[PDB]
Write a protein that binds this ligand. Structure first.
Ligand SMILES: CC1(C)CCN(C[C@H](O)Cn2nc(-c3ccc(C(F)(F)F)c(CNCc4ccc(F)cc4)c3)c3c2CCN(S(C)(=O)=O)C3)CC1
Length: 221
């Protein structure tokens, strides 16, 4: 029914890994990455979208607190309400809280809608990654093993389904009996597998990967 493996990087839909630094903006990076993939499918152009734009402008009205955390779903709502999000190049990432500096002149994407998936359904998530594109999700990253991850299929016994770090699922697969999720993180290229972490799949919603998945869309109309 579904493909055994997916890697949205192979279709040119994933921008370079970013470096969030001391600013807790992983929620913003999760959000732009998902929308970038929809933009590339829609327009044929791969352009990084401004995570800083979300940190500075999708704030209190959306329950977000910039470098102190946020949600991807209300980040998408902001983009809908704002009728735009800027390119990352026009509004680059500074890893701190700033005044909203959105400028419609440098709008690089829109958002028509977003969709949330039901908690813990890794089959429903697998289908969405296959059929819709990369999915924004939260994970439990509050473990030293996460910070220290270098390669392989990550499994942390003490992981919980409560989420606290925004990431982007750009794929899934199976490595020698270990089914994994392919996860784009925002800790630069030196983390994990060139900025990615492959996380255990179909192991009881391990680290909450499927706790709060969502994805945006950019419709023709
Ligand atoms: C629309 C509303 C008004 C606002 C959004 N609401 C979402 C709803 O509460 C569902 N939800 N979503 C998340 C969720 C999903 C992804 C991410 C991530 F990706 F960033 F990591 C995170 C982390 N950031 C949280 C955060 C947000 C603002 C802030 F300043 C500081 C921190 C949380 C959680 C929950 C319930 C409780 N969990 S938990 C402990 O894991 O069970 C966390 C619904 C009402």
């Amino acid at each position: 029914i579904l493909p055994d493996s997916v890697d949205w990087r192979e279709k040119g839909c994933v921008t370079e890994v970013k470096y969030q630094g001391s600013c807790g903006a992983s929620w913003a990076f999760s959000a732009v990455g998902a929308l970038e993939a929809q933009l590339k499918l829609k327009t044929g152009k791969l352009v990084s979208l401004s995570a800083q734009n979300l940190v500075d402008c999708s704030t209190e009205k959306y329950g977000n607190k910039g470098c102190n955390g946020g949600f991807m779903t209300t980040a998408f709502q902001y983009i809908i309400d704002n009728k735009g999000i800027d390119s990352d190049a026009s509004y680059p990432y500074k890893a701190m809280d700033q005044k909203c500096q959105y400028d419609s002149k440098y709008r690089a994407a829109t958002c028509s809608k977003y969709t949330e998936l039901p908690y813990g359904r890794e089959d429903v998530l697998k289908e969405a990654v296959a059929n819709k594109g990369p999915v924004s999700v939260g994970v439990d990253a509050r473990h030293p093993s996460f910070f220290l991850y270098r390669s392989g299929v990550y499994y942390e016994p003490s992981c919980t389904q409560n989420v606290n770090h925004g990431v982007l699922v750009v794929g899934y697969g199976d490595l020698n009996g270990k089914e994994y999720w392919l996860v784009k993180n925002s800790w630069g290229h030196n983390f994990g597998e060139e900025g990615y972490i492959r996380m255990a799949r179909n192991k009881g919603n391990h680290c909450g990967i499927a706790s709060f998945p969502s994805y945006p869309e950019i419709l023709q109309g």
